[PDB]
Design brief:
This is part of a larger assembly, with chains A (129 residues), B (82 residues), C (156 residues), D (123 residues), E (80 residues) and F (205 residues).
Chain A: H1 5-18, E1 23-27, H2 30-41, E2 47-51, E3 57-61, E4 64-65, E5 68-69, E6 74-76, E7 85-86, E8 100-105, E9 108-111, H3 112-117, E10 122-128
Antiparallel strand pairs in A: 1-3, 2-3, 4-5, 6-10, 7-10, 8-9, 8-10
Chain D: H1 3-8, E1 29-39, E2 49-56, E3 61-65, E4 78-81, E5 94-95
Parallel strand pairs in D: 3-5
Antiparallel strand pairs in D: 1-2, 1-4, 2-3
Chain F: H1 7-14, H2 49-64, H3 68-80, H4 85-94, H5 97-103, H6 110-118, E1 122-124, E2 127-128, E3 140-144, H7 152-163, E4 170-173, E5 178-181, H8 196-202
Antiparallel strand pairs in F: 1-2, 1-3, 3-5, 4-5
The chains are: A alpha+beta (129), B alpha+beta (82), C alpha+beta (156), D mainly beta (123), E mainly beta (80), F alpha+beta (205).
Chain D binds 2 RNA strands through α1.
Chain lengths: 129, 82, 156, 123, 80, 205
RNA sequence: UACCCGCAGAAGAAGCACCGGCUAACUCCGUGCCAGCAGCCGCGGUAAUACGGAGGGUGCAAGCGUUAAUCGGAAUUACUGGGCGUAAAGCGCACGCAGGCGGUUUGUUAAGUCAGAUGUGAAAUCCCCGGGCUCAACCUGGGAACUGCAUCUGAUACUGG
RNA sequence: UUAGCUAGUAGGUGGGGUAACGGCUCACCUAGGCGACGAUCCCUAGCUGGUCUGAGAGGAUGACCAGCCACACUGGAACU
């Protein structure tokens, strides 16, 4: 059965980039739209949009620069089989700080650098670079 | 009874005594309740060869700790110099 | 101008009706002590001719690696058929911590302080292919900044 | 593979056995040799290897190779085995040190003298 | 204000005593997985109001018996 | 704890002059410097990468007369300190007492300077110091003893010292026979033919 | 006693392992699958850089080799960090209790998680900056670290009720 | 290639006992209590701060120093 919608979202993004798709569509969720918002303000996806009322569908407009895809490595970190939680002083720097790590803190979900600035840790949802 | 004494903690022929608050039954270099200072018997000039935490030492004497003969002389020296 | 290094020379064979024919293969790497490096694999019946073919093949099909002042720019890992390779930047004066073919290709490629490690098979041809593969897909701060459309200060 | 499986049954290590069990984690062991004989080596080589069957002081009965050229070893001699197999003999796993309690050193040896127990020749 | 624990009641057959299972959630020391670990405790239950499957709240007190050092303070979710 | 064999043999094996002699005479007039020692010296065998790293390490060790145990301790200390490992190791090596005595020209060779230090003829900050491996710090003034100040070899070495380049991190007064170590020598002051990065990767396998 | 001063004289003071490849360092003579070497691949069967001796060289040095034992290399029990078509590896197939995991929205709780504070984590040892034995080993001042546990207050995005 | 273990055994009332709580002990009543998150049985082992190694996570280890426990020819028992 489908037991990890966030991983499914990351997988749709990765496959669409590999297959040179302009946009991808998936069933929405408040956490998916939140990660999508983080990616848009960090310049990984062009724009996100959610339509529908009873079964809302989120559509992500992918981004391409110089022919090739922008996101070249995206992976789920805390997966249902093994959860990962890290304190603020030991947060990881993905690709020496050039990449980002989507971390879910108490004050919403934000990037690792923002979490370090704000001084609080949380659950590490995924790395994206 | 609780005492304040010297712990021989140093190399051969160059002693260095740690002024510790220890239960008198225990060994010299062994168990102690709180460390309250040091005493270097062979120290040269320009460096403090003795430092005592007189506040804690006074607190322990108020708590009932006795004082050794050498510890008494060292407190006398510290209070005379300072 | 370019520095050329010979990595490994071995004798390959080939059996024919007459008997065994022994040939030589030469794996060399060339580079400009900066971002340009390239490897060549030549084969002939004699070792001078083999090394010469290797140098000509190495001087062509080179790539530009966006390296830092004297080191890499982030931990990167590469793979080519049997050698999972991982390498990361190091502080000044620690040297090239690498083994076999990796040491030669890094040294010629201009990096000076790097911690490296080779997993899987440590076959020289495969590790020198995997090393330049990782180096080729190593992102730079300006490239990722221009790619995502943000300033280099915004990404740090 | 799966973390759940590893929680239910942890990763078993691989206990390595010693290739010199008769020493019992001691650097050398004294023994008295019950037999002194020769034997032939394995497939590539051919010789008459000088070996002795020794009874160790801990009860074990093992064979040991007598290094060097020539030896005065006969039955009821107290020697010292030290470990280290010879690749090319089946079942010989130990070497007898030359120069300990009865086994004299190899005569006319001028190089690698320490390994066979010979005093320095005075000039 | 005072240290207190909660847990399911797994047994109540003996008079004036019940067995309480505290269920903590600890990370595994090596593999990092969060697993449920239970700890059965013998708890003094005056008046015997507790039954099978009711979550209770216990506090540690002086030793009532060989295996009883905890006692309950109230009972919530008394349903069958 | 000191090498007592032929000095020029080491220089021949390393290929270059390791300054193991005073420098009054031409090196070529005493040895076949371009040729490795021994019977099979004419041949130039192809040296392995481990070989070139080991040769550089031995080259430096023979230059400064240090042994392996002391050198490895120096490397551990250098690796422990902050900054560039190679510069720290070269600085630590350059901070030795006898080495500083040679740089100041009191001793013609480093071996002569070492014998000078060991034979109670040097004083660091007025106190007699006898240990050859003594690390000197910035702003330290070193001088010969009053009794040993009349030795012919000392002035004979001071005149020879003028032929070589003058260290920019020292201040020597040849009349009173005293110097002043004001700072640890930067790599740019050191000879650039030593590839210290080979040693720092040879020892960190 | 440490330490210092004076006296005579280069005297009273260098050995061990290795040199076919791994592995830095090569030739000659005796022996002919014998004697023998060896940690692995492997030498020696009458032209051995692989045995034994000599000369030369290489590495260490008041030590040098060999053995025993642990870790590393070994990503060769892989949590970080491996695989299962043919190299070792998908149970012959299915149902299913305990167990692991779970679509999407709102409210409540705060157990898991995160932040802060307090108590504690003995001294020594490890690490940082200094000080004392001529230096070093050694001793020592102060700090950091002891990644943990308990309590109080708060955050509620994710997991759990 | 140890799946069942336990009758003072688990709990209650009361008496005795300990410096002190307590099946620590005794009389009666209840038939319980431990166990797949490994009880019971077998082999090995003093435990810790730490030590060696490793980049780290780990692996191995507990000699010197220091903390705790246990033992004094072997097996018990009390007295001050």
């Amino acid at each position: 059965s489908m037991q990890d919608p966030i991983a499914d979202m990351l997988t749709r993004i990765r496959n669409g980039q590999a297959a040179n798709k302009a946009a991808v569509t998936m069933p929405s969720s408040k956490l998916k739209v939140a990660i999508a918002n983080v990616l848009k303000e960090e310049g990984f996806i062009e724009d996100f949009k959610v339509e529908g009322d009873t079964k809302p569908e989120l559509e992500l407009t992918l981004k391409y620069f110089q022919g090739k895809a922008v996101v070249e490595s995206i992976q789920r970190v805390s997966r249902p089989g093994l959860r990962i939680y890290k304190r603020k002083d030991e947060l990881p720097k993905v690709m020496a700080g050039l990449g980002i790590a989507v971390v879910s803190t108490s004050k919403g979900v934000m990037t690792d650098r923002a979490a370090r600035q704000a001084g609080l840790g949380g659950e590490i949802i995924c790395y994206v670079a | 009874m609780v005492t304040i004494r010297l712990a021989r903690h140093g190399a051969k022929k160059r002693p260095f005594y740690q002024v510790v608050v220890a239960d008198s039954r225990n060994a010299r270099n062994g168990r102690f309740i709180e460390r309250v200072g040091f005493f270097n018997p062979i120290a040269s000039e320009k460096e403090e060869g003795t430092r005592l935490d007189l506040d804690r030492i006074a607190h322990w004497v108020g708590q009932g700790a006795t004082i050794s003969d050498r510890v008494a002389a060292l407190i006398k020296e510290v209070n005379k110099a300072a | 101008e370019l520095q050329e290094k010979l990595i490994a020379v071995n004798r390959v064979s080939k059996t024919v009706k007459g008997g065994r024919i022994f040939s030589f293969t030469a794996l060399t790497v060339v580079g400009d002590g900066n971002g340009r490096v390239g490897f060549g694999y030549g084969k002939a019946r004699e070792v001078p001719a083999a090394i010469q073919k290797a140098m000509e093949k190495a001087r062509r099909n080179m790539i530009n690696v966006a390296l830092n002042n004297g080191t890499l720019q982030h931990p990167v890992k590469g793979v080519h058929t049997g050698s999972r390779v991982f390498m990361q930047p190091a502080s000044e004066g620690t040297g090239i911590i690498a083994g076999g073919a990796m040491r030669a290709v890094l040294e010629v490629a201009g990096v000076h302080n790097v911690l490296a490690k080779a997993y899987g098979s440590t076959n020289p041809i495969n590790v020198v292919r995997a090393t330049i593969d990782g180096l080729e897909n190593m992102n730079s701060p300006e490239m990722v900044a221009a790619k995502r459309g943000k300033s280099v200060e915004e990404i740090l | 593979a799966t973390v759940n499986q590893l929680v239910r049954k942890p990763r078993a290590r691989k206990v390595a056995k010693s290739n010199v069990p008769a020493l019992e984690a001691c650097p050398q062991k004294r023994g008295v040799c019950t037999r002194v004989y020769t034997t032939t080596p394995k497939k590539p080589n051919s010789a008459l290897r000088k070996v002795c069957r020794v009874r160790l002081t801990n009860g074990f009965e093992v064979t040991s190779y007598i290094g060097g050229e020539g030896h005065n070893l006969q039955e009821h001699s107290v020697i010292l085995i030290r470990g280290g197999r010879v690749k090319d003999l089946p079942g010989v796993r130990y070497h007898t040190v030359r120069g300990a309690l009865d086994c004299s050193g190899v005569k006319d040896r001028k190089q690698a003298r320490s390994k066979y127990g010979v005093k320095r020749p005075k000039a | 204000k005072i240290r207190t624990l909660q847990g399911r009641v797994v047994s109540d057959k003996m008079e004036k005593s019940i067995v309480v299972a505290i269920e903590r959630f600890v990370k595994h020391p090596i593999y990092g997985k969060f697993i449920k670990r239970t700890t059965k405790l013998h708890v003094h239950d005056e008046n015997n109001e507790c039954g099978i499957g009711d979550v209770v709240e216990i506090r540690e007190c002086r030793p009532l018996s060989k295996t009883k050092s905890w006692t309950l303070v109230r009972v919530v979710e008394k349903a069958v | 704890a000191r090498y007592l064999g032929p000095k020029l043999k080491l220089s021949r094996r390393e290929g270059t002059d390791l300054f193991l002699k005073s420098g009054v005479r031409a090196i070529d007039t005493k040895c076949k410097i371009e040729q490795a020692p021994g019977q099979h010296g004419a041949r130039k065998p192809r040296l392995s990468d481990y070989g070139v790293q080991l040769r550089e390490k031995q080259k430096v060790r023979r230059i400064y007369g240090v042994l392996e145990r002391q050198f490895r301790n120096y490397y551990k200390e250098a690796a422990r300190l902050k900054g560039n490992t190679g510069e720290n190791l070269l600085a630590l090596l350059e901070g030795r007492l006898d080495n500083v005595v040679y740089r100041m020209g009191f001793g013609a060779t480093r071996a002569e300077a070492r014998q000078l230090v060991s034979h109670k003829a040097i004083m660091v900050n007025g106190r007699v110091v006898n240990i050859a491996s003594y690390q000197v710090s910035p702003n330290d003034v070193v001088s010969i003893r009053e009794k040993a100040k009349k030795q012919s070899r000392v002035k004979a070495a001071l005149e020879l010292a003028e032929q070589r380049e003058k260290p920019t991190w020292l201040e020597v007064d040849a009349g009173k026979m005293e110097g002043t170590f004001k700072r640890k020598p930067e790599r740019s002051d050191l000879s650039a033919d030593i590839n210290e990065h080979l040693i720092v990767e040879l020892y960190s396998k």
